[PDB]
Design a protein around this ligand. Structure first.
Ligand SMILES: *Cc1c(COP(=O)(O)O)cnc(C)c1O
Ligand SMILES: O=C(O)c1cc(O)c(O)c(O)c1
Length: 811
């Protein structure tokens, strides 16, 4: 149908049709008289999967023969979403399968909608890991993603009476056709026990054993016949475990609970034992796998030439002392050699500077769970602080600031300090964030070892986030500049030469409007909500946090409503304001914010004087598959975190690529995006990082803003008095009290400038042609924010390997 989706050759279509029928009969054990759409989805998935495995087997065979340097990307989260369409796109099968299914009397888009999201992440960190696997395969790197196969991913969000309710995401219920269980490569992991010192060195004994069973998922590159592996571990009890009889069998659940459920905290540290077990479990199983593979290719001097381990945040930081434990206690390397190998192997990516996200584990937990690792950590710390003492003699304060051991009521290990000490490279995820690391939180470490500190600005994959979710936009671009941009996103710069082309302007605007109509229809169908598709689609989708300032959006929404009520017959640009995202189950303030948004909705959406000029919708159950629908439909992207708090963001980049303009602060990657597009083509507002520091020095007093801005005062008086909660007048007192007395994120300080910036947005939207021209300028400069660029930089500057766009042999 459209050229970017590949060829529908008669031979191929014919062969897909017979394999589809073969799987329905032999695999699913159904006939067409009893088959549901779900059976048809599974028949298709198995048909597509068969095309992967030939390339999968020869990719891994190729790596065995050529023995390249291997990249191990360790993460506790991989937020994969759906796999079917991605696989078709990457294999050039999408049109062929569409035709094949059409000829069987089936609508492929309907079958795509049956697939569950693999929701094994919380938000940005997990999604980024998935983006990265796609780019690593596309760039021909011998890369492996290693994580945990959680039985339950991020919870499904239900809204009941305006309140978030959680339910278990039972994503494996119908089976996962993409994974292959590999029970033959099951490995033991140890916990508890104690350390004995012999003349033969330390021995870790009397441990409890949990088994790690791997499940492999294929990760295909974009049209290059490379298929890499994501290996996810599942926890199994050994068969002698607890072995009255019945209770011993049932107690197997204790061990298997390790892989049961993803911790639902985005950017927040909860020091629970089960979480620590998950962290060690992934690390210990992964490292044995790495070492096995290395030995099949005494001399660990070559280990860093053959292995790179990338730590995604501090969650797998125990890789450092585990690698030392294996090298020293089991392989009998001397400490200094082992440490050299470790440092050259490991690299650490930091994802946030917020203190509540920092992992600081109590010593007593490590003492009980991982007694050998604690000893190793103490030894690492002592040798590290000896180096600090020699470099800065007499600076005793530096010694306690830099220590891996934090003193206090409870002693803790700072895992970020551990990662810096044991890694040859430490990076932030956007220029401003990487600079913040060197200036503030890791300043001491930067002074000791400046060479370690890098930047690697994040990116997103143009496969999932353009071709897959916005085929219309991909096509009209391909018409003008061809298809090479899909794996070389800088080629979008060629679109600058079409900024005055009247046909292009019209096509860009038509794609947006088609996307908006499709999404408006989706809203009616699944959620009984009727919206104006000629309104500006103003969207804020991301996890609910105080730092992301969904509350600032709320204050703007209420300002618009109040302004309409004051002058009802004045023209205003119509808006549909959409806000979506999950709150962590125990994050009470985030849950109150969700309730506020729905409460504003209840008032605004049923006020006849407003009509269809303002609508406020809370998008329920925001997840990767919902992102793929709403982002192509957006006009305005809300990226309004307090300056200095959002390390990078990736959502911001997705919107930029899909033809939305951005309203935001000079935070995270917004800075580099505005720099690429030109500040004239971005709606920047609010305090810079430096203004926030100055406000902190003087002391933030929110009452000042309340006293001098009458529009703000009116909103606070509405919230306090029960305007948005008549049955429960005091319902929002915690929100008001936070805003007035304890606001770490300075919502009121950016209110005036935000409101004025929003007026400029409205002004521009009234002139469709100039709106669309500015959109073209954003899309055309979004090339830097490809994850292919990011990964090429990791490969060259950290891992020491060369990317490649060269095909491997088909079929
Ligand atoms: C991209 C994405 C995120 C990250 O969005 P930010 O705005 O950068 O926080 C979170 N969740 C999902 C489902 C995504 O696709
Ligand atoms: O501020 C909090 O108490 C908080 C913040 C979070 O981001 C979170 O996931 C949580 O469970 C609690």
């Amino acid at each position: 149908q459209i050229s970017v989706r590949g060829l529908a050759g008669v031979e191929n279509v014919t062969e897909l049709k017979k394999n589809f029928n073969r799987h329905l009969h032999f695999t699913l054990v159904k006939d067409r008289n009893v088959a549901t759409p779900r059976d048809y989805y599974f028949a298709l998935a198995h048909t597509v999967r068969d095309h992967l495995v030939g390339r999968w087997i020869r990719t891994q065979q190729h790596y065995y023969e050529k023995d390249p340097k291997r990249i191990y990307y360790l993460s506790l989260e991989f937020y994969m979403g759906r796999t079917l369409q991605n696989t078709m796109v990457n294999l050039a099968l999408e049109n062929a399968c569409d035709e094949a299914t059409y000829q069987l009397g089936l609508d492929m888009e309907e079958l795509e909608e049956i697939e569950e999201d693999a929701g094994l992440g919380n938000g940005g960190l997990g999604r980024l890991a998935a983006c990265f696997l796609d780019s690593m395969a596309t760039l021909g790197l011998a890369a492996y993603g290693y994580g945990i196969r959680y039985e339950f991913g991020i919870f499904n969000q239900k809204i009941c009476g305006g309140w978030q309710m959680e339910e278990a995401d039972d994503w494996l219920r119908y089976g996962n056709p993409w994974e292959k269980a590999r029970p033959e490569f099951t490995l033991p992991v140890h916990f508890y026990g104690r350390v004995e010192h012999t003349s033969q060195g330390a021995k870790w004994v009397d441990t409890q054993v949990v088994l790690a069973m791997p499940y492999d998922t294929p990760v295909p590159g974009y049209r290059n016949n490379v298929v890499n592996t994501m290996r996810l571990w599942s926890a199994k009890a050994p068969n002698d475990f607890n072995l009255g009889y019945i209770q011993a069998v049932l107690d197997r659940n204790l061990a298997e609970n390790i892989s049961r459920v993803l911790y639902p905290n985005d950017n927040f540290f909860e020091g629970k034992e089960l979480r620590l077990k998950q962290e060690y479990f992934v690390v210990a199983a992964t490292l044995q796998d790495i070492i096995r593979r290395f030995k099949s290719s005494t001399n660990f001097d070559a280990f860093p030439d053959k292995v790179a381990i990338q730590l995604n945040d501090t969650h797998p930081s125990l890789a450092i002392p585990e690698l030392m434990r294996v090298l020293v206690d089991l392989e009998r390397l001397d400490w200094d050699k082992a440490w050299e190998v470790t440092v050259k192997t490991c690299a650490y990516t930091n994802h946030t500077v917020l203190p509540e996200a920092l992992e600081r584990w109590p010593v007593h937990l490590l003492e009980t769970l991982l007694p050998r690792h604690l000893q190793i950590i103490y030894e690492i710390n002592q040798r590290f602080l000896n180096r600090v003492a020699a470099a800065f003699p007499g600076d005793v304060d530096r010694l306690r600031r830099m220590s891996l051991v934090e003193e206090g009521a409870v002693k803790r290990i700072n895992m970020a300090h551990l990662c810096i000490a044991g890694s040859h490279a430490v990076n932030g995820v956007a220029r401003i964030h990487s600079e913040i690391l060197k200036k503030t939180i890791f300043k001491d470490f930067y002074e000791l070892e400046p060479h370690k500190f890098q930047n690697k600005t994040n990116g997103i994959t143009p496969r999932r986030w353009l071709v897959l979710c916005n085929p219309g936009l991909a096509e009209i671009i391909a018409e003008r500049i061809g298809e090479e941009y899909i794996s070389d996103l800088d080629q979008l710069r060629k679109l600058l030469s079409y900024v005055d082309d009247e046909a292009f302007i019209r096509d860009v605007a038509k794609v947006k409007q088609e996307n908006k109509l499709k999404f408006a229809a989706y809203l009616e169908r699944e959620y009984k909500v009727h919206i104006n598709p000629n309104s500006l689609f103003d969207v804020q989708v991301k996890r609910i946090h105080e730092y992301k300032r969904q509350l600032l959006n709320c204050l703007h929404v209420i300002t618009l409503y109040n302004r309409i009520k004051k002058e009802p017959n004045k023209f205003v640009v119509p808006r549909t304001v959409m806000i979506g995202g999950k709150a962590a189950p125990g994050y009470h303030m985030a849950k109150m914010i969700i309730k506020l948004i729905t409460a504003i909705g209840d008032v605004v959406n049923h006020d006849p004087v407003v009509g269809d000029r303002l609508r406020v919708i809370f998008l329920e159950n925001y997840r990767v598959s919902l992102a793929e629908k709403v982002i192509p439909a957006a006009d305005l992207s809300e990226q309004i975190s307090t300056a200095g708090t959002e390390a990078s963001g990736t959502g911001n980049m997705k919107f930029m690529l899909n033809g939305a303009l951005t309203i935001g602060t000079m935070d995270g990657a917004n800075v580099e995006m505005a720099e690429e597009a030109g500040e004239e083509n971005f709606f920047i507002f609010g305090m810079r990082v430096e203004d926030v520091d100055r406000l902190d020095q003087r002391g933030y007093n929110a009452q000042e803003y309340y006293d001098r801005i009458p529009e703000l005062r009116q909103i606070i008086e509405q919230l306090s008095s029960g305007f948005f909660s008549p049955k429960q007048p005091d319902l929002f007192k915690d929100i008001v009290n936070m805003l007035m007395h304890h606001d770490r994120f300075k919502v009121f300080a950016d209110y005036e400038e935000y409101v004025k910036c929003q007026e400029r947005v409205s002004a521009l939207y009234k002139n469709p042609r100039e709106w669309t021209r500015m959109v073209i300028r954003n899309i055309a400069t979004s090339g830097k924010f490809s994850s292919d660029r990011t990964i090429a930089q990791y490969a060259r500057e950290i891992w020491g390997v060369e990317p490649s766009r060269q095909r491997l042999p088909a079929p």
